[PDB]
Amino acid sequence: SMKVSRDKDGSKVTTVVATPGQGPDRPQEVSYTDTKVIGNGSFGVVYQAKLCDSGELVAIKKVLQDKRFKNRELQIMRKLDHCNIVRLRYFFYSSGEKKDEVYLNLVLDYVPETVYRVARHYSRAKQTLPVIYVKLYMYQLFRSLAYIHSFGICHRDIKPQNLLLDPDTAVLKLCDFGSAKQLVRGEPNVSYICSRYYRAPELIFGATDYTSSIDVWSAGCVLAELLLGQPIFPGDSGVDQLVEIIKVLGTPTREQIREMNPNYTEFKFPQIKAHPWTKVFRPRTPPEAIALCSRLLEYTPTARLTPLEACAHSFFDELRDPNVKLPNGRDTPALFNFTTQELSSNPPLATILIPPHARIQ
Amino acid sequence: MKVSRDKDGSKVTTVVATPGQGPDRPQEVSYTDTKVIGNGSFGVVYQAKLCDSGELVAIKKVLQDKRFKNRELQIMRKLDHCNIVRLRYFFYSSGEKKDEVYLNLVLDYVPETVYRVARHYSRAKQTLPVIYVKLYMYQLFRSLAYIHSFGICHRDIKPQNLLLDPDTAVLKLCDFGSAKQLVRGEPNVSYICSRYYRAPELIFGATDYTSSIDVWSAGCVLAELLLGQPIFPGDSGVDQLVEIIKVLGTPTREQIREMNPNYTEFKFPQIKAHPWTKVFRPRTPPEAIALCSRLLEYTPTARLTPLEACAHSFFDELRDPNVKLPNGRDTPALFNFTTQELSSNPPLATILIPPHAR
Numbered sequence: 001s002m003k004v005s006r007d008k009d010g011s012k013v014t015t016v017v018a019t020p021g022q023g024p025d026r027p028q029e030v031s032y033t034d035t036k037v038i039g040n041g042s043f044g045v046v047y048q049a050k051l052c053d054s055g056e057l058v059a060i061k062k063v064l065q066d067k068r069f070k071n072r073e074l075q076i077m078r079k080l081d082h083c084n085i086v087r088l089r090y091f092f093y094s095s096g097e098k099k100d101e102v103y104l105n106l107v108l109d110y111v112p113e114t115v116y117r118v119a120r121h122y123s124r125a126k127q128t129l130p131v132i133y134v135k136l137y138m139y140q141l142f143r144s145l146a147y148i149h150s151f152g153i154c155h156r157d158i159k160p161q162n163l164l165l166d167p168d169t170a171v172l173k174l175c176d177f178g179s180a181k182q183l184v185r186g187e188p189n190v191s192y193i194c195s196r197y198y199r200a201p202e203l204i205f206g207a208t209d210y211t212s213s214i215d216v217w218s219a220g221c222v223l224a225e226l227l228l229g230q231p232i233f234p235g236d237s238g239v240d241q242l243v244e245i246i247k248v249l250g251t252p253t254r255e256q257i258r259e260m261n262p263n264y265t266e267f268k269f270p271q272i273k274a275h276p277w278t279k280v281f282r283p284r285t286p287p288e289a290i291a292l293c294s295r296l297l298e299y300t301p302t303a304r305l306t307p308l309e310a311c312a313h314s315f316f317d318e319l320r321d322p323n324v325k326l327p328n329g330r331d332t333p334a335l336f337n338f339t340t341q342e343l344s345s346n347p348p349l350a351t352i353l354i355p356p357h358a359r360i361q
Numbered sequence: 362m363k364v365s366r367d368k369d370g371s372k373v374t375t376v377v378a379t380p381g382q383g384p385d386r387p388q389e390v391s392y393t394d395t396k397v398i399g400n401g402s403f404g405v406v407y408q409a410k411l412c413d414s415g416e417l418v419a420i421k422k423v424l425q426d427k428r429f430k431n432r433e434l435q436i437m438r439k440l441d442h443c444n445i446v447r448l449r450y451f452f453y454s455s456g457e458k459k460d461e462v463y464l465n466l467v468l469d470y471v472p473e474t475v476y477r478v479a480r481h482y483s484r485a486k487q488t489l490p491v492i493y494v495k496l497y498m499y500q501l502f503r504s505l506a507y508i509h510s511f512g513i514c515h516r517d518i519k520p521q522n523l524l525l526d527p528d529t530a531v532l533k534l535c536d537f538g539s540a541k542q543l544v545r546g547e548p549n550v551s552y553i554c555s556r557y558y559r560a561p562e563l564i565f566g567a568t569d570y571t572s573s574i575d576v577w578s579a580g581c582v583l584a585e586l587l588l589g590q591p592i593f594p595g596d597s598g599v600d601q602l603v604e605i606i607k608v609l610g611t612p613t614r615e616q617i618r619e620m621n622p623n624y625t626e627f628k629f630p631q632i633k634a635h636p637w638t639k640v641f642r643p644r645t646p647p648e649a650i651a652l653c654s655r656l657l658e659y660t661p662t663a664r665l666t667p668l669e670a671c672a673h674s675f676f677d678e679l680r681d682p683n684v685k686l687p688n689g690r691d692t693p694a695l696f697n698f699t700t701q702e703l704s705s706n707p708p709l710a711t712i713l714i715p716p717h718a719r
């Protein structure tokens with residue numbers, strides 16, 4: 001049930017009764033107006049709306065509700081609370097004319113930009129994003145990956161379109177969990193998740209026993225794309241994607257193929273040596289960024305850095321400097337308020353992750 | 362290879378190349394006017410002019426593994442069809458720098474592709490006339506019916522790999538770098554075939570697929586030509602599958618088992634079957650929609666064979682004795698079938714060869 005109405009200057013106003021995303025189930029009277037679509041596709045429509053009272057902008061994701069099982073994205077969104085993940089404020093059910101079908105609406109934070117759009121603005125003008133922003137955007141993404149992985153949840157669709165951005169505050173928030181799923185060892189999972197360009201090689205090889213390290217590969221493809229100005233492993237087919245991976249990483253040894261897809265899909269690749277990673281990027285590319293890419297984009301999934309280990313990489317040392325600031329003068333967003341949940345994968349890493357100045361009493 | 366010039370300042374290359382569809386007696390071949398016309402993954406595709414007949418040719422240059430023999434070459438020397446690009450010659454040469462051997466494939470030159478022609482009508486906000494949809498689709502099925510009779514699967518049917526001569530309306534299939542003979546019992550990789558056109562059993566990661574993946578990809582080209590845009594788009598397999606469910610409906614558990622037996626352990630939203638007639642524009646011929654529904658089937662064994670598609674009622678206008686091209690010329694070769702081409706279903710010759718043919 002929803003109650004449509006108007007204000008007194010015009011302005012159509014919708015009022016729903018929604019459940020808080022987190023906390024106890026205390027129903028909520030939420031009124032919003034100025035509804036405008038901000039893109040759809042597959043899952044459904046994603047709207048933008050303005051809250052009537054406070055005037056804040058929010059996003060509403062409207063998908064079809066399977067009457068059999070409850071929506072998996074909703075069960076995950078309610079378990080999550082992190083500064084680098086888009087927050088589920090409320091959620092409610094509704095319809096739309098007859099249909100006899102139920103729609104699930106997820107009221108989330110609104111963030112005005114995406115990494116895809118920002119990287120495209122710089123790419124169209126023949127230039128790359130300033131490295132300080134690349135450090136800030138990837139650190140916050142690796143922080144969000146270390147959080148959901150602590151719960152065993154794999155995003156399974158890391159791409160620049162799913163990385164929201166506030167340009168003023170440099171805050172990054174991961175969004176779109178319609179492909180996320182808790183990965184339990186011994187259980188199989190579908191191999192056709194994740195978008196092109198960013199699929200881990202074990203996904204291209206059709207493996208079903210993959211771990212959360214596929215998110216680390218996809219995040220590594222985002223970092224290299226921001227450095228190169230174009231996707232590092234493009235291709236319209238899995239064969240084309242693999243060729244671009246062989247071009248950089250080299251031919252995968254037989255033991256590396258076993259770690260990816262143990263099924264051995266029965267293919268023989270051309271033998272190409274290892275592209276020295278320094279030749280892949282621009283001349284003035286920071287070598288620490290090149291070092292991070294090589295440690296994220298590894299054939300062997302267990303050899304890739306964990307999200308928490310990526311945050312502690314030397315490429316992010318500038319963010320731990322006490323005098324670091326955004327170019328526009330403001331302070332950096334919160335980068336060191338780690339929780340025990342966040343550090344559970346490797347608590348001793350807090351000796352590096354939390355700089356001394358972040359502990360000044 | 363011996364680089365030289367003419368006498369007007371043109372630069373001419375002469376190599377000793379082996380005829381593709383011959384015994385094995387190399388000749389001296391000279392070409393000029395070399396220009397890049399394609400690149401990516403495999404290598405570079407050049408265009409050249411034969412110094413004798415002035416005939417335009419395409420040279421596909423790829424790197425050669427010294428271990429095994431290039432599988433594309435071994436397939437090309439076996440093929441001889443009017444709707445498949447012809448391997449005129451092939452030769453080896455150096456390049457790059459680390460003493461690496463390069464294989465060069467001298468093929469036919471066809472000036473246009475289905476992708477580029479369709480992209481023009483899409484930009485101009487119109488649809489390709491159905492007569493051209495008939496001619497292009499028919500010749501593509503004829504090419505698939507040929508290679509499938511050898512057990513060869515193209516595994517990459519897409520409009521970019523469908524060359525077109527606009528004046529003669531001749532279609533020629535090209536790009537066999539993914540082609541492979543599919544033998545029952547042997548597994549084959551599931552990461553072949555380009556996006557938008559991958560068969561559903563490929564998205565499910567099945568390794569026991571048959572030649573019917575080309576038929577699905579063919580059906581995706583037919584739907585795209587009728588719509589003016591891809592019918593099953595998506596940057597991921599989940600997105601591609603959802604667009605398929607919206608048209609075909611939720612596949613029954615029987616259809617899931619026939620697609621990928623492993624059952625990838627996923628549950629899909631229960632969407633009813635979109636009426637095929639509501640997918641296309643109102644003026645779309647019903648015979649075209651009928652052919653699409655018989656190509657884009659969940660169960661791979663339920664899809665039409667390439668030969669059965671050539672005999673579909675959608676191509677009846679092509680068998681009319683008074684059909685002509687919009688530019689006035691006659692239709693190209695459409696009925697010069699061979700015994701090998703019809704081996705899948707010989708009784709179909711009564712329909713495929715109209716009474717007025719030879």
Ligand SMILES: O=C(NCCCN1CCN(c2cccc(Cl)c2Cl)CC1)n1c(=O)[nH]c2ccc(-c3cccnc3)cc21
Pocket residue numbers: 037038039046059061086108109110111112113114164175176177178
């Ligand atoms: O996407 C967001 N913001 C984008 C900024 C505004 N842009 C959209 C409108 N526009 C635009 C875009 C393209 C072309 C044109 Cl011509 C135009 Cl005008 C300008 C740019 N989200 C946000 O803020 N909270 C969210 C919560 C969940 C999801 C989400 C997305 C996908 C799947 N599931 C959930 C997305 C957002």
Ligand SMILES: O=C(NCCCN1CCN(c2cccc(Cl)c2Cl)CC1)n1c(=O)[nH]c2ccc(-c3cccnc3)cc21
Pocket residue numbers: 398399406418419421446468469470471472473474524535536537538
């Ligand atoms: O592709 C072919 N013809 C079409 C070339 C496409 N364009 C034509 C002209 N043109 C262009 C023209 C006007 C404006 C603009 Cl703006 C432009 Cl760009 C530029 C190019 N092939 C051909 O004739 N024989 C082949 C043999 C093998 C392969 C092949 C391709 C991929 C993998 N393996 C084999 C391709 C051809």
